[PDB]
Amino acid sequence: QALLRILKETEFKKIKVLGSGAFGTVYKGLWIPEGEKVKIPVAIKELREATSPKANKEILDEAYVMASVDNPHVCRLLGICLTSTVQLITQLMPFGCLLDYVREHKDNIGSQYLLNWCVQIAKGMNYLEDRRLVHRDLAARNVLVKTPQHVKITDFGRAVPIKWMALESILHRIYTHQSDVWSYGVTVWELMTFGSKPYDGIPASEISSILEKGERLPQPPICTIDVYMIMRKCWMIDADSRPKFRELIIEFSKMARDPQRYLVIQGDERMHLPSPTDSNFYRALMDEEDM
């Protein structure tokens, strides 16, 4: 209700293209408050099409729900502008997404960051499950980095990412919170391989077959089997044998309490988490919300 602000086109401008989503493009933009002199960096998503008083009504009423979330590991929709092209505005995460982050930082990611990222993603997904919100598009590209010690899940509930979807989602359009657990396992697979393309070299029209014959993503080199068994149980075809996000929070937390025991990274002992000094400095500059 009061969590979604309706904007004018005059109080924000799109400045640089950051990327394409499925149904729209995301820009880096600037918010100019009315009667003010300051300019605040923001992220604007302009939708591919459809300005219709009628489609606006489902866009708005679902934007209200995406403005309702309150969790440190879930992004909140902040505003909307209902012109000819719908424009959506969120906070800009200056570090980008976890996917390009682990791809451009593959030689400096320690084990202790990866397991904490897995935990944080699970807390965000567990909160959405507690809010009865299905993500439907969880992937390393939809996990944003506020600080390297703080990731947030974005772009949930929007409803093709075939290589992330559960088989019941591929064959029968079923989207549950257990289907999201499947996409969570692929997301962990992306993190542990430092941004590899899942099922690389296999047409998306062919994934349903290989999953029915038992084929799964291979064990990442840095993962022990305790981590790989977790990923594989997120890919049981029976959805209720897949773990719950609540359980995934507990298990990855305990592995975070002994990181190099569960992830084997070359040179893992010269790369570590920030001290309280470095953490408090990050929070005072960029991350003042409670965590």
Added chain:
Amino acid sequence: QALLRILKETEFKKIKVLGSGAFGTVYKGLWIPEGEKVKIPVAIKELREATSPKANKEILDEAYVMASVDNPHVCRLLGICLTSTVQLITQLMPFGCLLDYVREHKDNIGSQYLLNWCVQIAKGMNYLEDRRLVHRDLAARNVLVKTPQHVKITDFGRVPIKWMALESILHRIYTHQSDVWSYGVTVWELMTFGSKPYDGIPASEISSILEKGERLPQPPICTIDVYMIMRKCWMIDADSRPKFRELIIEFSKMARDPQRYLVIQGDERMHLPSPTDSNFYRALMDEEDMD
């Protein structure tokens, strides 16, 4: 101890001059974390005198206390860089200082902002008094605007003749009650929206006119209730001046009926923001807790 980060000169640099004080220059600068690609805006104060490692320890020992404060209306020291000239790092407040703010928004400000700013400055000063920290240089230039609904006090802990209590001018005594005097001048600055106190009088003479009973005049928009409070901050007996806690209570009740205590032309179409615009401001700029 772990709240003050020691920086290297390679991970931050100065970008633009924001203003000077007397102890040194303040710059707008950018922090680049080591091994990272993003650039985070900061405020850097360069100590314009070059100091020695012996003076550095006295600089450091007070920097730790300036990094120890935790209150929504007091700025916290975040970092320090100890080269030839010491550099000090805080959060950058993009709206600037309350002084230039009310000067550039003169008579576009309602009573409800003016009274809340008075409350917030008293809250910060009362927190400093509870920490047994004297400000010694309180003025509208040292009140930073994080957002228009949130101000913070900076540059405390250690000649502004026209702000000082009389015992500070004659006997250089600096108590929390001398800070109450300078608070009254600050409220005067806001209520005249950035006028020069005692404008046109040499500072070498302010002691004389204060012993003769002369004070700053009543601002046009102020009724006598608020002007009497300012006059009690300028009593020659230090223990007849009000306490900061009392100023919090007294300005708070006046804030609950602003148009009763300030008479501004057109005050009734300029209001405080709605929860929607406030939830929008904080999610972008002010994630800190606050009342």
